[PDB]
C-alpha cells in the first residue's frame with residue numbers, strides 16, 4: 235500500500251464515497267472514527283472496535299502528552315503497539331484540549347504554554363505538536379492551529395485564522411523535515427474563519443497553496459447549532475480541493491453526519507457514542523433512548539431491532555438498564571459496543587446508498603424514522 | 607446429563623479430582639467459581655469468563671434480591687437468560703451479606719429482617735432464601751444458615767450452629783417441596799461450629815442425617831488466619847461425607863486454595879481475583895504484583911511470563927499500569943480477565959497433578975516459587 239491515496243468511487247450531488255489507502259490499512263469513506271481519549275477507546279478492546287467495522291480511530295494528543303507521555307510511548311514502540319491497534323490512527327494536534335481542559339494558558343505567536351489538568355507545566359507549538367504526533371507514530375497528523383470560539387467577532391476570527399495559516403505552514407515544514415514521518419504518514423490542514431465566508435475562502439486558499447493530504451473544516455460544532463453549521467458547510471466545503479478528503483472535526487449526532495455528508499464531508503469523529511453510551515444513551519434507528527428510563531426495566535427486546543451488533547444479538551434492554559443503573563462496568567462495555575456498531579452501520583448505509591445513487595432517498599427515509 | 611452426579615476420578619492423600627455433572631454442564635473439580643456480585647462477573651462478558659476456563663460461576667442472592675429483584679429476574683426468564691451465562695450457577699443464600707452489608711437487622715428463629723443498603727425493608731428466612739434461589743433458577747442452591755463471627759465463644763458458636771442445623775432442615779424441606787427445583791437443581795448444606803472440633807462434628811452429623819448433594823465448610827476465612835483455617839480444615843473435612851463435594855466458601859488466595867485442596871476441598875469462590883484485579887493486583891507464578899507500582903511503567907513483559915491468557919498474549923505490564931493509574935475501564939477488564947484466567951490455570955494444574963499422583967510435589971514447587 236501507498237503512504238496515502240484517496241480515491242472517489244462514486245458521487246451523488248456533493249456526497250462522495252471511496253477509500254483512503256495507507257500503509258496500515260484501507261479507510262472506507264465516509265468514515266466515522268471512534269475516539270481513543272488516551273490510548274484506549276473507552277471500555278472496548280481494539281478487537282471489539284474493529285469488529286464493529288471501524289477502519290481508523292482518533293487519538294487525543296493532549297491527554298497522551300500528559301500521561302503516559304509521548305517520549306515514553308515512543309520508547310515502548312509507539313501508540314499502535316502500546317494499545318494494540320494496528321490499523322490507521324489519526325491524532326489531533328492537542329491545541330483544542332489545551333484551551334478547553336488546561337489551566338494557566340499563555341498564548342503567543344510561538345505556541346501555547348499551559349499547566350496540566352497535576353499542575354505540571356508544558357508547551358505546545360506547531361513544531362512540538364508535529365513532533366509529539368511523530369513520537370506516537372500517528373498515520374494522519376493534524377496541523378496545529380489556534381481555535382476560534384463561537385461567537386467570534388470578524389476581527390478576532392480573522393486574526394485567529396491568519397495565525398492558524400501561519401501555523402499550518404510551520405506544521406507542513408516540521409512534518410516534511412522528518413523523513414520517516416514524511417514518507418509514512420499523512421498531514422491534514424484545518425480551515426478556520428468562524429462563520430464568515432470571506433475568511434473561510436482566504437483560509438481554504440492558504441491551505442491549498444501550502445498543500446495537504448486532506449482538509450478539515452475546523453471551528454464548527456462549538457455552539458452554533460445545526461442550521462448554522464450546515465449554512466457554513468454549504469459554502470465552506472466547496473472551497474476545499476475536491477480530490478482530497480474533507481474532515482469535519484468533532485461531529486456528531488447521526489443527523490449531523492448525514493447532513494454533513496450531503497455537503498461533501500468524508501470523515502467524522504465524536505465522543506458522543508462512547509461518552510453518551512457510558513451515560514445510558516443508546517442510538518436506534520427510531521432515535522436515541524436513555525436505557526436508564528424505567529420503561530426499559532422489563533423490556534426483553536435488544537437495544538435496536540435491526541442492529542447486527544453482538545450486544546443486540548445476546549442481551550436485552552432490561553439487562554443493560556439494570557447494569558447501567560447499578561454502575562456496572564459491563565453496562566459501559568455493552569452500551570459502547572452497540573453505539574459504535576450503530577455508528578458504523580450508519581456509515582455503511584451511507585456508503586452503499588451513495589454507491590447506488592440513492593443517498594438522497596436514504597437521508598429522507600433516515601430522518602423520517604429517526605425523528606418520528 | 608443427570609440433575610447431579612459427583613464422580614471422583616483420582617485421589618492423592620486427602621486431595622481428589624473429578625467431575626460434577628449437572629443439566630447445564632460439567633464442573634471439573636477442584637473448581638474455582640468466579641463471583642458474579644449482581645448478575646455480572648464484573649468487567650467481563652460471560653463468553654470471556656468461559657474462555658478463561660470457568661465451568662460454573664457464583665451469584666450473590668442478597669444483591670439480586672434488592673436489585674433487580676428475584677421476581678423480576680424470574681419474569682424475565684431467570685438469571686442465566688438475563689445475564690447470558692448458560693452453564694451452572696451456584697447461588698449463596700443471602701445470609702452472610704445481610705449481616706455484613708445491610709442495616710436495621712433483626713434476627714430470630716424465623717429468619718432475619720433488614721433494611722437495604724435504599725433503606726427499603728426486606729425479610730429472609732430458610733424458606734424465602736430457597737424461593738429466591740428458585741426464582742433466579744440456580745443450579746446449586748445453598749441452605750440458609752446463621753453465620754458465626756470470629757472469634758466466637760463456645761456457647762455462641764454452639765447456639766448459632768444449632769440454629770443453622772434447624773435451618774438446614776427447613777432449607778431441605780423447602781427445596782424438596784418445589785418439584786421443579788428438586789428435580790433440576792442441587793442443594794448444599796453448610797457445616798458450622800467455629801474452630802471447635804466437637805461442634806464441627808455435631809454439625810457434620812446433623813447435615814449428613816438430613817442429606818445434601820454437597821457440603822460446605824462455613825465460618826472460615828473470617829479473620830482467623832491461614833494456620834488456624836488449615837487446623838480447622840484438618841479435622842473438619844474428614845467429618846463430611848467422602849462421596850460428595852466439599853465446598854470452602856470465600857477462599858481465597860492461591861496458597862489457601864492449594865492447602866485446602868491438600869485437606870480435601872473440591873470447590874472455591876472468592877472476589878479476590880476480580881475485586882483486587884480492578885484495584886491493580888495481578889497474580890503471577892512468582893507471587894502477586896501491584897501493577898500501579900512505578901517499576902512497571904516501562905515493563906514490556908506480560909503480566910505473567912507463562913500465562914496463556916489473551917491479556918498476556920497481547921498487552922504489556924506498561925500498558926496495563928497506565929490504564930489502571932488512569933482509571934480506564936479497559937484496565938479493569940484486562941486485569942480481571944488475566945486474574946480469573948490465572949486462577950483457572952491454577953485449578954487445572956491442581957487437577958492434572960492429582961490425576962498424575964504428583965500433587966504433593968506440585969504444591970511444594972508452587973510455594974517455593976510463589977513465595978520466593
Ligand SMILES: [Cl-]
Pocket residue numbers: 269271276505508509
Ligand atoms: Cl469517550
Ligand SMILES: [Cl-]
Pocket residue numbers: 641643648877880881
Ligand atoms: Cl468482584
Ligand SMILES: [Zn+2]
Pocket residue numbers: 537538541542543544545546547572573575576
Ligand atoms: Zn446493537
Ligand SMILES: [Zn+2]
Pocket residue numbers: 909910913914915916917918919944945947948
Ligand atoms: Zn494472563
